[PDB]
Design a protein around this ligand. Structure first.
Ligand code: BYC
Length: 284
């Protein structure tokens, strides 16, 4: 079937249920936890059955998804116990609008077979990004049962990130470099607390952001200030903030990025037996 969850009680029940399927459910779990805190991206949680769902989809509002080309906006978060149920659910036009450029995100690699099955039926092309999934050791101990080297306090200060910094974040983001990606980064900065390090000029020189899924993403250091431990400090401070508020700490790393594999090991972030996935789907 198809049920729209409404209210904190139902979202809290969903968040509790998803804890039993971490880390495969992590991408959905993080999204729901941040929904339960003002729902700044105006998302909604769909299930095939309630309370004992087999499939959950987090999706945006139809009237926010005006630009068929804005795959940053057109993002869906999915987790399923039953791939047949999942394929029947994603087949419903009320669940996913396959006529737009869109992104499916999941920490469940087995959905690959479902998305490939629908590509035939729904007339879309798919490109998969599959990366190493990391979780903080502390999140693993809390949900599924490491300090940086110090830096010079009169050179670097912890700061909030102004929406005006989006243009710089956008220049260094592997998925960015365009106007739609800039707008998405601005929405993440406006919606969620983020950390940067200000350098000697009071300008941001290192940063780490969070998106609507609660994942730590879009981190960078200006070339002039690289290899001094700055991004490790920014991510450490972001992670401790999330942990204090009972949010999961997680991230991913492309296998090309050895630097962020090293950073992750230094902070006791652990590679998981689930992968990070993003399926980029566009109509034929
Ligand atoms: C952000 C980096 C990648 C690193 O920033 P920096 O401040 O320079 O890094 P640190 O100084 O803290 O060093 C860390 C470790 O690397 C080592 N090390 C460092 N440099 C080198 C070197 N050249 N050659 C060799 N080794 C080098 C250094 O010794 C240290 O080793 P230890 O940990 O002590 O064992 C920066 O180069 C950049 O902006 N790149 C482009 C954008 C991009 O790729 N962004 C990231 C996209 S992924 C993402 O967003 C994300 C992922 C997970 C969680 C959250 C988010």
């Amino acid at each position: 079937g198809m049920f729209l969850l409404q209210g904190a009680q139902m979202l809290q029940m969903l968040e509790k249920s998803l804890r039993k399927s971490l880390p495969m459910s992590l991408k959905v779990y993080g999204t729901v936890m941040h929904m339960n805190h003002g729902n700044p991206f105006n998302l909604k949680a769909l299930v095939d059955k309630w309370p004992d769902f087999q499939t959950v989809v987090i999706r945006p509002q139809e009237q926010d998804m005006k630009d068929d080309l804005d795959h940053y906006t057109n993002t869906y978060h999915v987790y399923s116990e039953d791939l047949k149920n999942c394929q029947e659910f994603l087949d419903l036009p009320e669940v996913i609008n396959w006529k737009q450029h869109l992104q499916i995100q999941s920490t469940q690699s087995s959905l690959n077979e479902v998305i490939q099955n629908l590509a035939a039926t729904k007339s879309f092309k798919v490109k998969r990004s599959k990366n190493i999934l990391y979780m903080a050791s502390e999140t693993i101990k809390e949900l599924t049962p490491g300090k940086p080297k110090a830096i010079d306090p009169e050179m670097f200060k912890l700061s909030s990130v102004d929406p005006s910094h989006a243009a710089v974040v956008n220049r260094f983001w592997l998925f960015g470099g365009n106007e739609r990606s800039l707008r998405f980064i601005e929405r993440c900065i406006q919606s969620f607390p983020n950390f940067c390090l200000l350098g000697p000029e009071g300008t941001p020189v290192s940063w780490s952001l969070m998106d609507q899924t609660g994942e730590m993403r879009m981190a960078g250091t200006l070339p002039e200030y690289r290899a001094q431990g700055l991004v490790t400090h920014a991510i450490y401070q972001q992670a401790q903030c999330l942990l204090k508020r009972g949010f999961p700490v997680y991230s991913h790393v492309d296998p090309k990025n050895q630097i962020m594999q090293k950073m992750s090991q230094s902070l006791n972030h652990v590679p998981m037996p689930s992968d990070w996935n993003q399926w980029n789907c566009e109509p034929l």
